[PDB]
Design a protein around this nucleic acid. Structure first.
Length: 79
DNA sequence: ATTAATTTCTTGACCTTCCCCTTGCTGGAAGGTTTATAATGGGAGCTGTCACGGATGC
């Protein structure tokens, strides 16, 4: 909880590059929230990296997944 | 009130597609998973809309 609450600035700073008129801001924010929640258990911090750098890829994956599944009436898949 | 040559009915005997499938790939579509330097308070009207009640605060 404190890990995901200390890094909401990460999702609200990464959600600037995908602010198109397909979805609202809050859906992308809460999809990046579950992407960061997956990155918490996928972190494995013993390599010596920061959480923002590895969490950026997971949150961008969740953002692309939300813009692929949602933001379109005809649901076109992610590929 | 009779039946013998035609004219229909019925029954095997044949004739097509529909669909699944044959070995061997070959390509396309739908769904889920990582990627490991550094990334930490975002973004957008529109008012030049005017005149009523219904609820809030002295």
């Amino acid at each position: 909880k404190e890990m995901v609450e200390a890094n909401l600035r990460l999702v609200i700073s990464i959600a600037k590059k995908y602010t198109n008129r397909g979805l609202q801001f809050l859906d992308l924010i809460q999809e990046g929230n579950i992407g960061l929640m997956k990155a918490v258990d996928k972190f494995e911090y013993r390599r010596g990296y920061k959480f923002s750098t590895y969490a950026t890829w997971w949150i961008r994956q969740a953002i692309t997944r939300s813009i692929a599944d949602q933001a379109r009436t005809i649901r076109i898949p992610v590929h």
